[PDB]
Amino acid sequence: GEALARGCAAAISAQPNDPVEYLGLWLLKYVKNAEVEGNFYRERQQDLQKKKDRLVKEAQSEQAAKSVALTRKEAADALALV
Amino acid sequence: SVAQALAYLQVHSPQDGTSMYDHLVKLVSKVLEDQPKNAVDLLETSLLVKKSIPVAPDATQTQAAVSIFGDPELPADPPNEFEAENMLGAAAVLDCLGVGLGRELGVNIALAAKRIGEDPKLAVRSVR
Amino acid sequence: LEKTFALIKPDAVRAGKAQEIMQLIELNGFTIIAKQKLQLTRARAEEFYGEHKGKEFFPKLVNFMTSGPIWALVLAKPGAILAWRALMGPTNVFKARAEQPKCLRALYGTDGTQNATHGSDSPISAAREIKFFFPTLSGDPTIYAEPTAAAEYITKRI
Amino acid sequence: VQLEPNITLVLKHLASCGAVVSAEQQAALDHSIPIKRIEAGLRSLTLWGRLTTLNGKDYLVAEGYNVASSKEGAAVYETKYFYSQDGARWSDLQPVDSETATRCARIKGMLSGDPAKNYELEEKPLVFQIPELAVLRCRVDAIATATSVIPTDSTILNAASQVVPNRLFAGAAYPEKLESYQHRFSLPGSGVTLSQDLRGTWAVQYDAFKGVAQVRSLLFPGYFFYYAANELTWGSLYVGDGLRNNDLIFML
Amino acid sequence: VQLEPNITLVLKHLASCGAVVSAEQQAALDHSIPIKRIEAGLRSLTLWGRLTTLNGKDYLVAEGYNVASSKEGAAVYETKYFYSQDGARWSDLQPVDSETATRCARIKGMLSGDPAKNYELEEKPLVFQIPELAVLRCRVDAIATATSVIPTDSTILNAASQVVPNRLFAGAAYPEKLESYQHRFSLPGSGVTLSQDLRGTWAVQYDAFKGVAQVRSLLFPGYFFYYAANELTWGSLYVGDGLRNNDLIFML
Amino acid sequence: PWLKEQAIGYLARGVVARRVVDKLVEDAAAA
């Protein structure tokens, strides 16, 4: 698989004294990062969602007060012309 | 002044794994294999790349300075008597007049004169 | 770009002059790719000078190169190999002190073995020294990427 | 932007709040803090506070750490505490178990000032003997988890997911509002500030001409924090016996 | 990285060098500097120094500026100076013409301490009367153009070609060497440091354990500069009568 | 045996990326 080919690539590039052992170590680090990448993606997406939801609630909270003050002004000014 | 930049970029990092040159090499080597047909963000791809004898001075002078504080350690002969002036009051007077060495050094000087005047092997009558 | 391997020996370290030596190294246009302060053992100090197992002064040296901590450095500059040696100057401290009174060894050396520095001499030897001390820094994957020698290195790896 | 609080500026700005140290102890600290910081291998070490005792030998407490990391949504600082009674020789202030934490939480009053003393508690009649340094460490832990104030967005997360100083920090826009400050253990960008604390447990006095804000804890009276906005420095200090103010609802 | 020198840290670090101020003057400065800085519209204002007089009313001198710009290869600071004799009320220290600069340069001795006094000079016999504040301004100008020390690469040039603090400054690599410091009016990246000055006019003492370097001027004895490397602060102060040391070749 | 030449292509790609970065820093200096 790609693991074997890239491990041989590393064993030729870095040129270790013990090729097989360093190869295995690199294999293990790679198979850990294979999950770490998806975990990073999950973290980023979830944090962005949290941010957006906080901002959505901050917006609705002000929309409510806008409407309430507007209704107050509505009634107050309507009384003037009756 | 181009080999200067290329040399600077390869300054290996003890904290991180490798140099900045190698970081960019790995980033580009991934992108050339990644081939984002639509687009890609630099920050996120660089983050995905990254996520995949002590040298201390000698404390002799400082410890000698700190040893004048408190009382020495015992594994005691009587300290000899000596006369002197009010040295903390001297630091205060000098500080009020705007001369001298301050008032932290006044404390250090008073404790040093104490360590001198109270010495058996040096039978002192008075210190100033 | 040329990378050379340097060394600050225990006599300069004990005199409190490693910082001055590094500052002069960088005042002379060099760039310290890496620095480290380690303590060399006996067998590793042997294998480092392993090409002088039959030399007479070998024990006299190896007992000195373990007398304390050393500074291993990797320097880089356009034409770095020979400029570093022109900086270290002659190997005999007295010869150097006679010829170049402002040289490095003429300022921080005392003896024919207490010269305070040790550069490389040939690019082969420089690469070998660096791979010995800093086995992490990758050195020219371009050159070692021979399309034929790679199959032979695979035979070696198997 | 500072990299670490400066004890000189702290003692200068928080002296009006009565947070002072003796002169001898000030000099002794100026010498002793670097020694202990080096010989413990720590990147940061500062004076945390000073707890008064019944025999006049107050405990000076110092707090240090090496690196802070983001774990489980919290910025965790692996802190280590030291104590002293003269300002010259620092001893360790070892952590306490969770079971003993409750018992020392039950012990009140001003500390004795004798590190060898131990108090007694009675339960169902099983008697426990709690060392005084245990009580000290827990009071410090309580005060620390309550306050630990820094400015907002003064820290930042780096590639290794560690909390480091934000060297491009420009300052708090509104220094007289509690939104400008936060707890240390709140992650950068989490939006949790001191305004999310129980309303009425913090007071803020801001001198808008000199640009110095003082944040006082009312829940733990004795914790003071200062923030100077023209020089971009800040720092805190605790001075007092270490007991929480439980009558706060009746005092506001 | 500091944004402006702090007078408290300056007076704390340079007190060993005898650069001290009275206690009353210290408090008075703590109040008066912000007032004058605001009511003059200046971004920076610090205590420059203190010149001794014959009647005991030493002149405190403060220096302020708004922005520094690169002009003709020099980092020019449009500085403005103020003087005081009590530390509470600052008056202007107005510039002096070039023709009068020579005459006041010829006047020596310790200043009188009476701002209304004027000295006399004789030339070809035309007599000139030079006000004392002119002499004071000239001495301050000479000392300023001689020393004005900052660390190297602590400033930087911005897009508008103005000299601003380098907020990513990491510190001087070798604090005990004169290459780590430079004049203020040297452009960033120009490579001109204090080592280009006349060899022997500067002394450097570096406490490598605490990390505090002290740079003393030998040409103008009385100018002290400090640099603390663990906290990344620095600052200078002049204390003395303001006369240059011309016998330097015989004293080294 | 097919892994050999695949690794060869990987190493050639690495050299390619190295030269790319060389040109990139060369351009950055002029910029």
Added chain:
Amino acid sequence: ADVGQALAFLQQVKTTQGASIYEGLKAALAKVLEDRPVNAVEALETSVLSTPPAAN
């Protein structure tokens, strides 16, 4: 000869927050070389390829 192909490829693909990934990296490197920052490798993500939240 693949060098020119890769260069065209990089000058082709556009940044998410810009264009010409090649030119983005070039501006990043020019900024890093303009003022060699403290911990440049770490400053890559905290000062140049991003912006801290309270920067101005």
Added chain:
Amino acid sequence: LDTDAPLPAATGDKVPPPAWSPVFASASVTTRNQVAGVRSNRWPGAVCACAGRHFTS
């Protein structure tokens, strides 16, 4: 001040805390020209001090 009523006992100790405590100007009894005084435990914040014929509260 020896005769002032002590504070009530607090949990953890049976002895009533005293009404006043000492404050010291040095960590060694041998230091010359020391100053000293007392601080209140009933009113935390009040202090009295005396060096020679000179005292304050």
